[PDB]
Amino acid sequence: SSFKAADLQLEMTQKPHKKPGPPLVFGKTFTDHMLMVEWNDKGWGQPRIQPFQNLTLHPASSSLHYSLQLFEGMKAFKGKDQQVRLFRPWLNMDRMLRSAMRLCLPSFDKLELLECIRRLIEVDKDWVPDAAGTSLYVRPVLIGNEPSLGVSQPTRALLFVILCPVGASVTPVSLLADPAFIRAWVGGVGNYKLGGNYGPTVLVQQEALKRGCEQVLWLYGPDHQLTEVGTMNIFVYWTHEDGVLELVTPPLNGVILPGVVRQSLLDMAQTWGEFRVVERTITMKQLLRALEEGRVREVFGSGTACQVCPVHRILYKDRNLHIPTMENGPELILRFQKELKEIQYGIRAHEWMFPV
């Protein structure tokens, strides 16, 4: 029953907002327009681009009671030629549909939404900044909207998309590694980008700050597996226990969100063929031995907001572990950053980019 971009409805604002002045804080500033699509028992309605406006919801909306909500996060970059491109948007649409199905929310056509998103970004092109290291953040959302307190498959839903000009990497982060905090469980929904996975992390992150750390290192299992850092996937660049240099990141076994940047770093590294690229469980036990034996070169997080984020300290069992990421260049990090920048800003042509 998918909505169609052909049926799009445009309604331009009466009074555009004054763009930012070359200090942009992430996700606070929004653009003039937004996409909105309604679903009900008659199926999907016509998508519309409309001025950025509030949502009107029935107070029993299942979005607000039973967390029938999921989101996405992706970026559009403006090249020198003032051309704007989305990075691997198809993977975000893929992941959004899976999230949708997990919450019994309505199915939709991935290319239709991608086209609607394209048009929306097209309409707000001038918001997309071109300054170094800047981008447009795109936040699609699908929430349920059943006006009743039954916990059930909804018969109403809203799909909408907002846009944020953003700025920001160079500086590393410190992590709190405390196993009392568990982000996701095998058989759970940690591998889907559902709102309910995030709310509970707010307190945990406050604890990390009180303990002088900047982010949370999410550990899993009795053997303390490194799963993710904050809202980022985790990569370790080391010489492994079998003497072979490798880039490792935990495998998609259910507690890991399959990042787009994660997959892209795996793709890039493999393409180079210069070292082993593997998806494997990483335990604190292995990390310690590797640190004491000097085999660790870099540790970083990956995610759309902070594409490659160096890690230099992990506070584990009340004692600080130094991570020599910044001493080792960080060569791999900077190399990852350089190529992604070349691709994203259109210096190198690449099928990963989708032009707006």
Ligand X SMILES: *Cc1c(COP(=O)(O)O)cnc(C)c1O
User: Which residues make up each annotated binding site?
Assistant: 137
Decide whether 70 or 120 has the Cβ nearer to ligand X: 70
Alpha carbon distance 231, 215 (integer Å): 9
Decide whether 88 or 262 has the Cβ nearer to Cl ion: 88
Site string for ligand 67X, 284-303 (x = CB under 6 A): -------------------x
Decide whether 174 or 197 has the Cβ nearer to a second copy: 197
Measure CA 122 to chain center: 22
CA angle 268, 273, 274 (to 5 degrees): 105
State yes or no: cis peptide before 330, omega within 30 of 0: yes
Q: Are 134 and 24 in contact (CB under 8 A)?
A: yes
Q: Considering CB under 6 A, how many residues would be counted as binding ligand X? A: 14
Considering only 12, 185, 251, 267, the residue that binds a second copy (CB under 8 A) is 185
Q: How many CB atoms lie within 10 A of CB 349?
A: 9
Within 8 A by CB and 6+ apart from 244, the residues are 275, 276
Is residue 277 at the binding interface for ligand 67X, with CB under 6 A as the rule? no
Decide whether 251 or 294 has the Cβ nearer to Cl ion: 251
Decide whether 173 or 261 has the Cβ nearer to ligand X: 261
* HSE value, Cβ hemisphere, 13 Å, CA-based, for 74: 28
Query: Which of the listed partners (ligand 67X, Cl ion, a second copy, none) does 191 bind, with a CB threshold of 5 to 8 Å by partner kind?
Result: Cl ion
Decide whether 175 or 256 has the Cβ nearer to Cl ion: 256
Sites for a second copy among residues 27-56 (CB under 8 A): 27-28, 30, 34, 52-56
- Give the residue closest to ligand 67X by C-beta: 303
Nearest one of 294, 279, 56 to 156, comparing CA atoms? 56
Paired tokens of 333: 């990090």
Is residue 149 at the binding interface for ligand 67X, with CB under 6 A as the rule? yes
Give kind and range of the element (H or E) at residue 321.
strand 319-322
Query: Which of the listed partners (a second copy, Cl ion, ligand 67X, none) does 203 bind, with a CB threshold of 5 to 8 Å by partner kind?
Result: a second copy
Is residue 174 at the binding interface for ligand X, with CB under 6 A as the rule? no
Is residue 99 at the binding interface for ligand X, with CB under 6 A as the rule? no
Alpha carbon distance 304, 166 (integer Å): 11
Sites for ligand 67X among residues 221-260 (CB under 6 A): 231-232, 259
Alpha carbon distance 321, 314 (integer Å): 5
Query: Which phi and psi angles does 97 have, rounded to 5°?
Result: -65, -45
Minimum CB distance to ligand 67X, residue 307 (Å): 8
Decide whether 26 or 272 has the Cβ nearer to ligand 67X: 26
- What distances in angstroms separate CA 145 from CA 41, 50, 215, 264, 332, one per listed residue? 12, 20, 33, 35, 45
Is residue 27 at the binding interface for ligand 67X, with CB under 6 A as the rule? yes
The residue count for the chain: 356
Alpha carbon distance 241, 286 (integer Å): 8
Minimum CB distance to ligand 67X, residue 99 (Å): 12
Give kind and range of the element (H or E) at residue 277.
strand 276-279
Alpha carbon distance 33, 9 (integer Å): 12
Paired tokens of 217: 């290192």
Query: Which of the listed partners (ligand 67X, ligand X, Cl ion, none) does 228 bind, with a CB threshold of 5 to 8 Å by partner kind?
Result: ligand X
Q: Which stretch binds ligand 67X (CB under 6 A): 30-38, 277-285, 304-312, 322-330?
A: 304-312
Decide whether 49 or 91 has the Cβ nearer to ligand X: 91
Residues that bind ligand X in the complex, under the rule CB under 6 A: 73, 193, 228, 231-233, 257, 259-262, 302-304
Residues that bind ligand 67X in the complex, under the rule CB under 6 A: 26-27, 73, 149-151, 231-232, 259, 303-306
Residues that bind a second copy in the complex, under the rule CB under 8 A: 25-28, 30, 34, 52-69, 71, 101-104, 137, 139, 141, 143-144, 148-153, 160, 162, 164, 179-182, 185-189, 194-203, 205-206, 231
